Motif scaffolding. Structure first.
Motif, PDB file in Angstrom:
ATOM      1  N   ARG A  33       0.729  -1.318   0.144  1.00 52.90           N
ATOM      2  CA  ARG A  33       0.007  -0.031   0.076  1.00 52.90           C
ATOM      3  C   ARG A  33       0.854   1.211   0.044  1.00 52.90           C
ATOM      4  N   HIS A  34       0.319   2.213  -0.558  1.00 51.64           N
ATOM      5  CA  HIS A  34       0.972   3.370  -0.780  1.00 51.64           C
ATOM      6  C   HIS A  34       0.244   4.812  -0.599  1.00 51.64           C
ATOM      7  N   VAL A  35       0.759   5.560   0.480  1.00 53.67           N
ATOM      8  CA  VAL A  35      -0.039   6.906   0.772  1.00 53.67           C
ATOM      9  C   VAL A  35       1.064   8.253   0.479  1.00 53.67           C
ATOM     10  N   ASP A  36       0.291   8.847  -0.384  1.00 46.12           N
ATOM     11  CA  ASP A  36       1.278  10.352  -0.817  1.00 46.12           C
ATOM     12  C   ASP A  36       0.698  11.415   0.051  1.00 46.12           C
ATOM     13  N   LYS A  37      -0.651  11.824  -0.142  1.00 49.32           N
ATOM     14  CA  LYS A  37      -1.034  13.098   0.208  1.00 49.32           C
ATOM     15  C   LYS A  37      -2.277  12.935   1.191  1.00 49.32           C
ATOM     16  N   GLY A  38      -3.217  14.007   1.092  1.00 49.25           N
ATOM     17  CA  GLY A  38      -4.385  14.004   1.771  1.00 49.25           C
ATOM     18  C   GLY A  38      -4.948  15.196   2.441  1.00 49.25           C
ATOM     19  N   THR A  39      -4.239  16.398   2.218  1.00 47.77           N
ATOM     20  CA  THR A  39      -4.708  17.601   2.553  1.00 47.77           C
ATOM     21  C   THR A  39      -6.040  18.217   1.578  1.00 47.77           C
ATOM     22  N   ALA A  40      -5.446  18.381   0.373  1.00 49.64           N
ATOM     23  CA  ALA A  40      -6.214  18.910  -0.588  1.00 49.64           C
ATOM     24  C   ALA A  40      -5.858  18.393  -2.085  1.00 49.64           C
ATOM     25  N   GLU A  41      -4.560  17.669  -2.234  1.00 51.51           N
ATOM     26  CA  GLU A  41      -4.120  17.472  -3.759  1.00 51.51           C
ATOM     27  C   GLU A  41      -3.659  15.874  -3.474  1.00 51.51           C
ATOM     28  N   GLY A  42      -3.586  15.431  -4.747  1.00 55.00           N
ATOM     29  CA  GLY A  42      -3.030  14.081  -4.738  1.00 55.00           C
ATOM     30  C   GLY A  42      -4.173  13.316  -4.967  1.00 55.00           C
ATOM     31  N   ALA A  43      -5.485  13.632  -5.432  1.00 48.87           N
ATOM     32  CA  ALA A  43      -6.151  12.843  -5.586  1.00 48.87           C
ATOM     33  C   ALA A  43      -6.340  11.856  -6.781  1.00 48.87           C
ATOM     34  N   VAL A  44      -6.882  10.510  -6.559  1.00 45.81           N
ATOM     35  CA  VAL A  44      -7.158   9.711  -7.927  1.00 45.81           C
ATOM     36  C   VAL A  44      -8.191  10.185  -8.806  1.00 45.81           C
ATOM     37  N   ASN A  99      -3.386  13.943  -8.456  1.00 47.39           N
ATOM     38  CA  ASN A  99      -3.979  15.395  -8.529  1.00 47.39           C
ATOM     39  C   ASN A  99      -5.010  15.551  -9.353  1.00 47.39           C
ATOM     40  N   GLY A 100      -4.714  16.562 -10.372  1.00 47.50           N
ATOM     41  CA  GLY A 100      -5.807  16.901 -11.179  1.00 47.50           C
ATOM     42  C   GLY A 100      -5.284  16.950 -12.694  1.00 47.50           C
ATOM     43  N   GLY A 101      -4.164  16.201 -12.931  1.00 48.14           N
ATOM     44  CA  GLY A 101      -3.598  16.184 -14.169  1.00 48.14           C
ATOM     45  C   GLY A 101      -2.292  16.922 -14.290  1.00 48.14           C
ATOM     46  N   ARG A 102      -1.264  16.506 -13.363  1.00 55.54           N
ATOM     47  CA  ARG A 102      -0.011  17.018 -13.338  1.00 55.54           C
ATOM     48  C   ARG A 102       1.097  16.045 -13.266  1.00 55.54           C
ATOM     49  N   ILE A 103       0.933  15.095 -12.461  1.00 54.38           N
ATOM     50  CA  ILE A 103       1.810  14.138 -12.311  1.00 54.38           C
ATOM     51  C   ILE A 103       1.030  12.572 -12.265  1.00 54.38           C
ATOM     52  N   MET A 104       1.562  11.779 -13.046  1.00 49.18           N
ATOM     53  CA  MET A 104       1.171  10.421 -13.504  1.00 49.18           C
ATOM     54  C   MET A 104       2.028   9.250 -13.271  1.00 49.18           C
ATOM     55  N   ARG A 105       1.592   8.398 -12.374  1.00 49.92           N
ATOM     56  CA  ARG A 105       2.857   7.413 -12.283  1.00 49.92           C
ATOM     57  C   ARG A 105       2.182   6.018 -12.530  1.00 49.92           C
ATOM     58  N   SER A 106       2.749   5.054 -12.936  1.00 48.94           N
ATOM     59  CA  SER A 106       2.181   3.722 -13.221  1.00 48.94           C
ATOM     60  C   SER A 106       2.728   2.658 -12.351  1.00 48.94           C
ATOM     61  N   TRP A 107       2.089   1.920 -11.560  1.00 52.41           N
ATOM     62  CA  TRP A 107       2.292   0.728 -10.700  1.00 52.41           C
ATOM     63  C   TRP A 107       2.336  -0.580 -11.246  1.00 52.41           C
ATOM     64  N   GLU A 108       2.989  -1.665 -10.658  1.00 53.57           N
ATOM     65  CA  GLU A 108       2.894  -2.850 -10.974  1.00 53.57           C
ATOM     66  C   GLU A 108       2.113  -3.816 -10.028  1.00 53.57           C
ATOM     67  N   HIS A 139       5.675  17.388   0.354  1.00 50.76           N
ATOM     68  CA  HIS A 139       6.201  16.773  -0.740  1.00 50.76           C
ATOM     69  C   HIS A 139       6.670  15.375  -0.477  1.00 50.76           C
ATOM     70  N   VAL A 140       6.034  14.412  -0.981  1.00 50.20           N
ATOM     71  CA  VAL A 140       6.110  13.018  -0.726  1.00 50.20           C
ATOM     72  C   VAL A 140       6.728  12.440  -1.934  1.00 50.20           C
ATOM     73  N   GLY A 141       7.920  11.670  -2.154  1.00 46.14           N
ATOM     74  CA  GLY A 141       8.168  11.018  -3.445  1.00 46.14           C
ATOM     75  C   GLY A 141       8.264   9.437  -3.331  1.00 46.14           C
ATOM     76  N   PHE A 142       7.930   8.724  -4.233  1.00 42.92           N
ATOM     77  CA  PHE A 142       7.993   7.486  -4.496  1.00 42.92           C
ATOM     78  C   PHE A 142       9.183   6.724  -5.141  1.00 42.92           C
ATOM     79  N   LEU A 143       9.617   5.408  -4.680  1.00 42.79           N
ATOM     80  CA  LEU A 143      10.650   4.817  -5.305  1.00 42.79           C
ATOM     81  C   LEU A 143      10.244   4.265  -6.631  1.00 42.79           C
ATOM     82  N   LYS A 144      11.503   3.935  -7.352  1.00 41.67           N
ATOM     83  CA  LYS A 144      11.146   3.200  -8.664  1.00 41.67           C
ATOM     84  C   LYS A 144      11.392   1.684  -8.316  1.00 41.67           C
ATOM     85  N   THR A 145      11.812   0.852  -9.395  1.00 39.32           N
ATOM     86  CA  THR A 145      11.830  -0.776  -9.552  1.00 39.32           C
ATOM     87  C   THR A 145      12.974  -1.245  -8.678  1.00 39.32           C
TER      88      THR A 145
END
Lengths: 128, 49, 139
Positions: A55-66, A81-90, C32-38
Motif C-alpha cells: 500500500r502507498h500513501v502520498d497526500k491527503g490535505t487537498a491534492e493528490g486525489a486519484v 492530483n488533477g492532471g499534473r503528475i501520473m505514475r504507473s504501478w505494478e 512533498h512525498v516521493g515514491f521509489l522506482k523498481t
C-alpha cells in the motif's frame, strides 16, 4: 527486553479508506486485488486471505486525489492530483514502473488507443 | 501529534509522547525540557540534580 | 517556477526489489512525498524555491537525511544536515547516492551474569574456601 516480548500484549489493525476505483481483472488471479481509495492511498488486498500486500500513501490535505485508473495485463496506470503528475504501478511486485509530468490543464478523460495490434499509446484529453 | 501520559494518582514520571511523519512514536522525559536549566554549571545546581 | 530532484539509493546487499516494498521519501515531511522506482530512485517534481531535507523513510534499513539548497537560477547545492551551525561544511556532488548503514537498533540488550564472573561476589568467594577445605577431606 523488547525483542523477548515481541507481541505479548500489543496489536495493530491496518485499514484503508472507502473503495472508489477497484478493478477485478487478472485472469490468472492468484490472490491479487487492487483498490485505490479516496484518501490518497492505493492498497492491494488478497482474494484468498484478505491481508494487505503493498500500500502507498502520498497526500491527503487537498491534492493528490486519484481521478482515473486504467488496467493493462500486468501493469496498472493511474493519474493523481488533477492532471499534473501520473505514475504507473505494478501488481506482481510493489513500486513504480514509470512517471510522467503533464501540462497545466483540467483532466477530463483518458483512454487507450491501439495502433493496429495492441495498445501502444494512452490518450489524455484536458479542457483545451 | 503530541500527548502526555496521565496517571490516576500521579506519582510516576511525566513522559511526553511525540509522533513522527515516519510513524514511530517517541516518548521523552519532561525532566530534560525543564526551565530550571542553568547556563553555566553551578555548584549547588550540579550537586542537587 | 518549478524544479525536480532525482536521486539513487543503493542497499549494500539483499535485493533492490525486496527493499522497494513499503519505501517512500520525504522532502519536508508531509508537504512533498516521493515514491521509489523498481530498483531505486526518487524523482520529485512540483517544487518551489527553498532549502529542503531529503530523507528516505523505511521501517527497515534507515538513511541519513541530506540537506539540499535550490536556487531560482537553477543551481543545486547539497550539504550535511546541520542545525547548531548554519554554514557550509562539506560539498558533495548533486546525484544523491544514499548508503544505508543497516537495521537501526529498535530493542535494548540485557546481559546475564557469567559463571567465571559470578565468582567475584563477596559471598560466593567466602564459600569457596569451605568448599575447598571440605573437598580436600575425602581426598
Amino acid at each position: 527486553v523488547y525483542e523477548d516480548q515481541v507481541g505479548k500484549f500489543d496489536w495493530r489493525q491496518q485499514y484503508v479508506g472507502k473503495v472508489k476505483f477497484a478493478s477485478l481483472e487478472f485472469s490468472p488471479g492468484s490472490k491479487k486485488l487492487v483498490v485505490a481509495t479516496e484518501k490518497n492511498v492505493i492498497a492491494a488486498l488478497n482474494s484468498r486471505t484478505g491481508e494487505i500486500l503493498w500500500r502507498h500513501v502520498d497526500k491527503g490535505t487537498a491534492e493528490g486525489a486519484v481521478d482515473a485508473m486504467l488496467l493493462h495485463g500486468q501493469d496498472v496506470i493511474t493519474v493523481s492530483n488533477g492532471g499534473r503528475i501520473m505514475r504507473s504501478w505494478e501488481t506482481n511486485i510493489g513500486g513504480l514502473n514509470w512517471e510522467i509530468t503533464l501540462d497545466s490543464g483540467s483532466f477530463q478523460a483518458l483512454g487507450l488507443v491501439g495502433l493496429q495490434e495492441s495498445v501502444r499509446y494512452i490518450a489524455v484529453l484536458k479542457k483545451t | 501529534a503530541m500527548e502526555a501520559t496521565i496517571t490516576e494518582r500521579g506519582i510516576t514520571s511525566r513522559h511526553l509522547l511525540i509522533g513522527l511523519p515516519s510513524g514511530a512514536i517517541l516518548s521523552l522525559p519532561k525532566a530534560l525540557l525543564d526551565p530550571r536549566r542553568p547556563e553555566i554549571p553551578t555548584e549547588q545546581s550540579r550537586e542537587e540534580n | 517556477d518549478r524544479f525536480k530532484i532525482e536521486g539513487r539509493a543503493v542497499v549494500p546487499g539483499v535485493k533492490p526489489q525486496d527493499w522497494i516494498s513499503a519505501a517512500r521519501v520525504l522532502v519536508d515531511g508531509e508537504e512533498h512525498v516521493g515514491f521509489l522506482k523498481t530498483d531505486g530512485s526518487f524523482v520529485v517534481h512540483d517544487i518551489p524555491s527553498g532549502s529542503y531535507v531529503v530523507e528516505v523513510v523505511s521501517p527497515a534499513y534507515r538513511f541519513d537525511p541530506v540537506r539540499v539548497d535550490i536556487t531560482s537560477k537553477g543551481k543545486m547545492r547539497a550539504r550535511y544536515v546541520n542545525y547548531i551551525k548554519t554554514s557550509e561544511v562539506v560539498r558533495l556532488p548533486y546525484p544523491l547516492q544514499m548508503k544505508s548503514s543497516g537495521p537501526p537498533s529498535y530493542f535494548i540488550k540485557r546481559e546475564s551474569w557469567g559463571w567465571t564472573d559470578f565468582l567475584m561476589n563477596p559471598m560466593v568467594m567466602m564459600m569457596v574456601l569451605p568448599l575447598l577445605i571440605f573437598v580436600l577431606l575425602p581426598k
